[PDB]
């Protein structure tokens, strides 16, 4: 809702308020072609006779390094969007691994599950075992009673209400482990690596460009590359904590020991809260029936 | 000798919990979960085995070879005659 | 010369002058006929009330909708609607102003023939244009590409457009929109003991739907919250002074948009329609449509529809790429806003349909001219 | 034991025992309250006549219908109707006999809640069931599928039924039946 001169000066000035990802994608998809640029440069008549589209294209051609500037707009907004989506999720992943490696009520809980499982499978080959994998917590709801109403996990959280209620404070330690990652870390890692490569190429191009583009954009390029390097340091920390979590749960690191543990543990914490809710509903409905 | 392996046997037959058994040498590793739990100083919660035994243990009659729905439809069909 | 933009939607006709931001004349498309007997001789007892007069005096009027399921069924009623929106609302001569019009996707051709013949024989114009509603909504969103879920009063249609090319095979149509939600809301209010059987009561239930209903973010949690606590109950005052209070019906009514098995339709919700529209496109251009989910039509005015829609697509689509919902606040009039954008363009002078083109090529040049 | 069927219709209540083909107690659902001044001493005259007794002495009575358009308006009157059909017409103890009830489609649900509460608290039964009237009308015909137009005394409703399954969304209701025809004839 403004003239060609104002958006041309806004592109030249480096202002990104009215320029999000989609508008710059449309502008790059409506770039001028070679014969159009040559015909507008060979245009010698009065420029008022041209259309506003051709006048905007001549204003775009009047801007030095205009395509590189539009690339800088798109890469700055894209790098900001990628950091805003990836970095809190990667921080949640790092906090998830850090509070998965150390836990307080979880050894007591899994020791109690091992005692109950040794009681149930006594005399079998699986009994008299010193432990189990992390996938058994998903399999806790599978075993289910005579009345087909109470599972094993629901029974454990029923008896843990009366005996040792500190296990009910177990999801408090697991809330930064909760909600998992949401998306696969490798795909956004490749997106971050491609963005960092594009930003390094853009800084090399700006260093090959004029000093106006350098003073306008080099500090933003340096801040984006520094933030993406901090993100890559965070990814390397996530890889180190992934190897620590693989050695912690006694599983080899060649299999998916990062996202599968997050999904297994997220579904187990949701089953923890759901079993708490259904045992509260069972107690409340029994109290209502007694009244 | 560990606390969790001290299991009283059930009189009735119990329903089986299905899990993949970890080997005892792997679970007793120093980086494992279960080395801290094999010690007697850890808090081993006693399960109520009586409750688990209670809950997790194992006119002439009109004999028909048919389900109730088809018999219901046939009786509704026949009584209009 | 100022053009006219007039979306003749199923629900409400939205008209005004081109080059502007807001339509001056928004009014519902009903023709009201009196069903009782007149005794008071004189004072202009006109036999067929149209628009806002039919809305105001609706307690003695059988109301008829000329546009049913995006199809102009009754034609004399639609002519009366056009006569009221030109002569009484805008008060402009048609013969000195261009008139932009809108149309639903996958329309019958003879519908376009009849609309062209009315717009050139009865209401003579210098020029006019018929466009798809989703295309104008995408234009008012400011983007050339994207997928538009337009949900009006009768039709919820999904149209993906890539770089101005509206893909014809990937367009689909689901006959579930606002009037069906109003009829279902009539059906479920009888559980609370409120009876709404007349067509006059449809406007009251529609106003209840416009004012109080909202899209649930999770349906089962809202069932649990509604059955547990009566905190979400909301009261409404009827025009006779009575006050009703509705509970879960604020969000059971728009949930028909996600679960058509409530009213007994085998097809799935609008999310599956959007997703099956997306697999009908090329695999290169699917990425752009995920970030460009544009909505239009007033059935998208419920204030929980965007986050629920993003949740449903993100559940449906693979999570490797980005999902984004384009929901502007003025997407009710984005059909009209896109028409006002398209009407005042320098290029658009050469895509006008003149009277000479009409006389040479019948009322049939609209097929070969427009998409 | 032998079950009861009590079609608690909007104009007439039809009660009887199961296994039978003729309903034993067909009587209109009215409550007749006196309006004029009594001059006899000796008592005897009730303050509320229910059923055929209100029909016989109807020249000095205000008659109230408890059911209006398939909706029980006055629950005390309908309790009196239930008490009369359990204790006076059919003469059965409610707590030793199964009893089948009928209900019109698309009713308010709280009406069903209150009927369930009265049949499980006041006239508490060993068992009961509430079922759609058009389904039982189709069951009388000896067929499994078909459409039933049931036009009672308050509700005329259409129910199509396929293979014993009544299709819920296609059922429609019209508040025009025999009482409205009586008012129009009046
Ligand atoms: N604020 C609102 N909240 C919910 N629904 C609305 C609101 N405003 C309008 N609607 C519904 O959306 C429709 C809006 O009509 P519109 O989409 O502009 O044209 P049409 O539906 O006639 O093609 C109306 O039928 C109305 O039922
Ligand atoms: N022989 C008849 N001829 C015409 N109408 C009748 C006859 N018998 C009953 N009705 C009408 O039907 C009504 C009773 O219908 P009924 O089957 O009892 O409906 P409901 O069970 O819903 O009360 C009465 O009010 C009467 O007006
Ligand atoms: Mg519309
Ligand atoms: Mg009846």
Which pair of structure tokens corresponds to residue A224? 């984006």
The Cα D119–Cα D125 span in angstroms is 7
| Number of neighbours of residue C156 by Cβ within 10 angstroms | 27
Q: Measured on CA atoms in the order C353, C356, C357, C359, is the torsion positive or negative?
A: positive
B57 close to D (CB below 8 A): no
According to CATH, what is the number of the domain C182-270? 3.90.640.10
- List residues of A whose CB lies inside 8 A of any C CB: 22-23, 26, 29-30, 51-52, 85, 182-184, 187
| Chain C neighbors of A183, CB-CB under 8 A | 319-320
Instruction: Return the partners of chain B (3 or more C-beta pairs < 8 Å).
Output: A, D
Return the CA Rg of chain A: 30
Same CATH fold assignment for domains C1-27+70-134+334-370 and C135-181+271-333: yes
Which pair of structure tokens corresponds to residue C163? 């770089």
| Chain C neighbors of A187, CB-CB under 8 A | 320
- Is residue C30 within 8 Å of residue C54, measured between CB atoms? yes
D28-69: CATH architecture: Roll (2.30)
The Cα B43–Cα A106 span in angstroms is 11
D1-27+70-134: CATH architecture: 2-Layer Sandwich (3.30)
Q: Residue D28: helix, strand or coil by DSSP?
A: strand
Q: So where are chain C's domains? A: 1-27+70-134+334-370, 28-69, 135-181+271-333, 182-270
* Kind plus residue range of the DSSP H or E element containing A80: helix A66-101
| Strand-strand pairing, D49-50 and D31-34 | antiparallel
For C317-336, give the DSSP string: S-TTS---EE--TTTTSHHH
The Cα C140–Cα C133 span in angstroms is 11
Resolution (A): 3.4
Which residues does a 6 A CB cutoff place in the pocket of ligand 1?
C 9-12, 152-153, 178, 206, 209-210, 297-299, 301-302, 332
What's the length of chain A?
Answer: 291
Torsion of CA C118, C120, C125, C126, to 10 degrees: 160
Residue nearest to atom 26 of ligand 2 (CA): D178
| Number of neighbours of residue A211 by Cβ within 10 angstroms | 9
Residue C11 Cα: closest atom of ligand 1: 22
DSSP character for C87? I
- Counting ligand 2 atoms within 8 A of each CB, the residue from D152, D157, D180 with the most, and so the one to mutate, is D152
Torsion of CA A135, A138, A142, A148, to 10 degrees: 160
Q: Provide the CB-side half-sphere exposure for D155 (13 A, CA).
A: 23
The Cα A162–Cα A155 span in angstroms is 12
Experimentally determined by? cryo-EM
- Counting ligand 1 atoms within 8 A of each CB, the residue from C140, C205, C298, C336 with the most, and so the one to mutate, is C298
Q: Residue-wise over C225-262: b if at least 16 C-beta within 10 A, else e?
A: bbeeeeeeeeeeeeeeeeeeebebbbbbbbbbbbebeb
According to CATH, what is the number of the domain C1-27+70-134+334-370? 3.30.420.40
- Is residue D31 within 8 Å of residue D63, measured between CB atoms? yes
Ligand nearest to the CA of C68: 1
Q: Ligand 4 centre and the CA of D46: distance in Å?
A: 29
| Chain C neighbors of A51, CB-CB under 8 A | 346
Q: Which residues contact A270 (CB under 8 A, 6 or more apart)?
A: none
Q: Residue C276: helix, strand or coil by DSSP?
A: helix
| Number of neighbours of residue A20 by Cβ within 10 angstroms | 14
| Number of neighbours of residue C52 by Cβ within 10 angstroms | 16
Determine, for residues C190 and D109 on separate chains, whether the beta-carbon distance falls below 8 Å. Answer: no
| Chain B neighbors of D144, CB-CB under 8 A | 73, 76-77
Using CB atoms within 10 Å of the CB of residue C104, give its burial: 0 to 12 exposed, 13 to 18 middle, 19+ buried.
buried
Closest CA in chain A for residue C318? A183
The Cα C29–Cα C12 span in angstroms is 5
Q: Which residue of B35, B47, B49 is the best one to mutate when testing the A interface, meaning the one whose CB has the most A CBs within 10 A?
A: B47
Q: Provide the CB-side half-sphere exposure for C366 (13 A, CA).
A: 28
What's the length of chain B?
Answer: 81
Give strand pairing partners of C204: none
Pick the CATH number of C135-181+271-333 from 3.30.420.40, 3.90.226.10, 3.20.20.140, 1.50.10.20: 3.30.420.40
* Kind plus residue range of the DSSP H or E element containing A160: helix A152-162
Range A2-11, long-range pairs (CB < 8 A, 24+ positions): A4/A52, A4/A55, A4/A56, A4/A59, A5/A59, A7/A56, A8/A56, A8/A59, A8/A60, A8/A62, A8/A63, A11/A60, A11/A63, A11/A66, A11/A69, A11/A70, A11/A73
Note the Cα A63 to chain centre separation in Å.
38
Note the Cα C65 to chain centre separation in Å.
13
Residue nearest to atom 8 of ligand 1 (CA): C298
């Amino acid at each position: 809702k403004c003239s060609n001169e104002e958006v041309a000066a806004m592109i030249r000035a480096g202002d990104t308020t009215k320029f999000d990802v989609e508008v710059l994608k449309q502008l790059l998809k409506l770039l001028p072609e070679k014969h159009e640029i040559e015909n507008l440069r060979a245009f010698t008549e009065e420029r008022a006779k041209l259309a506003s589209a051709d006048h905007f294209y001549l204003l775009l051609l009047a801007i030095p390094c205009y395509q590189l500037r539009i690339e800088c707009m798109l890469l700055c907004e894209g790098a900001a969007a990628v950091l805003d989506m990836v970095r809190p999720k990667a921080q949640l992943v790092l906090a998830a691994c850090e509070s998965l490696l150390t836990s307080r009520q979880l050894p007591i809980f899994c020791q109690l599950i091992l005692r109950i499982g040794n009681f149930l499978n006594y005399g079998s080959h699986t009994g008299d075992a010193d432990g189990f994998k992390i996938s058994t917590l998903l399999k806790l709801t599978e075993t289910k009673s005579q009345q087909n109403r109470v599972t094993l996990l629901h029974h454990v959280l029923e008896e843990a209400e009366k005996s040792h209620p500190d296990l009910l404070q177990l999801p408090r330690d697991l809330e930064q482990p909760s909600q998992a990652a949401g998306i696969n870390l490798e795909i956004i890692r490749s997106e971050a690596s491609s963005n960092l490569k594009k930003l390094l190429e853009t800084e090399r191009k700006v260093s090959a460009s004029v000093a106006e583009v350098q003073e306008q954009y080099t500090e933003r390029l340096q801040a984006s590359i520094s933030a993406f390097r901090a993100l890559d340091e965070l990814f390397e920390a996530i890889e180190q904590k992934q190897r620590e979590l693989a050695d912690y749960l006694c599983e080899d690191a060649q299999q998916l020991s990062l996202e599968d543990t997050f999904s297994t543990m997220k579904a187990f914490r949701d089953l923890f809260l759901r079993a708490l809710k259904e045992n509260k509903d069972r107690k409340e409905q029994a109290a209502k029936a007694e009244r | 000798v560990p606390s969790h392996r001290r299991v009283n046997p059930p009189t009735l037959r119990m329903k089986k919990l299905n899990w993949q058994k970890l080997p005892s040498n792997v679970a007793r590793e120093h980086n494992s979960m279960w080395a801290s739990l094999s010690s007697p100083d850890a808090e081993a919660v006693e399960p109520d085995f009586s409750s688990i035994e209670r809950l997790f243990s194992f006119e002439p009659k009109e004999i028909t070879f048919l389900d109730a729905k088809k018999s219901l439809n046939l009786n509704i069909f026949l009584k209009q005659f | 010369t100022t053009a006219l933009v007039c979306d003749n939607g199923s629900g409400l006709v939205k008209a005004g002058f081109a080059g502007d931001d807001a339509p001056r004349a928004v009014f519902p498309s009903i023709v009201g006929r009196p069903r009782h007997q007149g005794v008071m001789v004189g004072m202009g007892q006109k036999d067929s009330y149209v628009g806002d007069e039919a809305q105001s005096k609706r307690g003695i009027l059988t109301l008829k909708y000329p546009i049913e399921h995006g199809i102009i069924t009754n034609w004399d009623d639609m002519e009366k609607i056009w006569h009221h929106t030109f002569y009484n609302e805008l008060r402009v001569a048609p013969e000195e102003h261009p008139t932009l019009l809108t149309e639903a996707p996958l329309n019958p051709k003879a519908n376009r023939e009849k609309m062209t013949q009315i717009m050139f024989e009865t209401f003579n114009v210098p020029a006019m244009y018929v466009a798809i509603q989703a295309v104008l909504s995408l234009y008012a969103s400011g983007r050339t590409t994207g997928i538009v879920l337009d949900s009006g009063d009768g039709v919820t249609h999904n149209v993906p457009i890539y770089e101005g090319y509206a893909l014809p095979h990937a367009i689909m149509r689901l006959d579930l929109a606002g009037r069906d939600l109003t009829d279902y809301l009539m059906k479920i209010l009888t559980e609370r003991g409120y009876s709404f059987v007349t067509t006059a009561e449809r406007e009251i239930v529609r106003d209840i739907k416009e004012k109080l209903c909202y899209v649930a973010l999770d349906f089962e949690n809202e069932m649990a919250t509604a059955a547990s606590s009566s905190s979400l109950e909301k009261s409404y005052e009827l025009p006779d002074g009575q006050v009703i209070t509705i509970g879960n019906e604020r969000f059971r009514c728009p949930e028909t948009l996600f679960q058509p098995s409530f009213i007994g339709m085998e097809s799935a919700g609008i999310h599956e329609t959007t997703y099956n529209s997306i697999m009908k496109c090329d695999i290169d251009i699917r990425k752009d449509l995920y970030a460009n989910n544009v909505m239009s039509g007033g059935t998208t005015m419920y204030p929980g529809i965007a986050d629920r829609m993003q949740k449903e697509i993100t559940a449906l689509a693979p999570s490797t790429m980005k999902i984004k919902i384009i929901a502007p606040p003025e997407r009710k009039y984005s059909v009209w806003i896109g028409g006002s954008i398209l009407a005042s363009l320098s290029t658009f002078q050469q895509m006008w349909i003149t009277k000479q083109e009409y006389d040479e090529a019948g009322p049939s040049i609209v097929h070969r001219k427009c998409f």
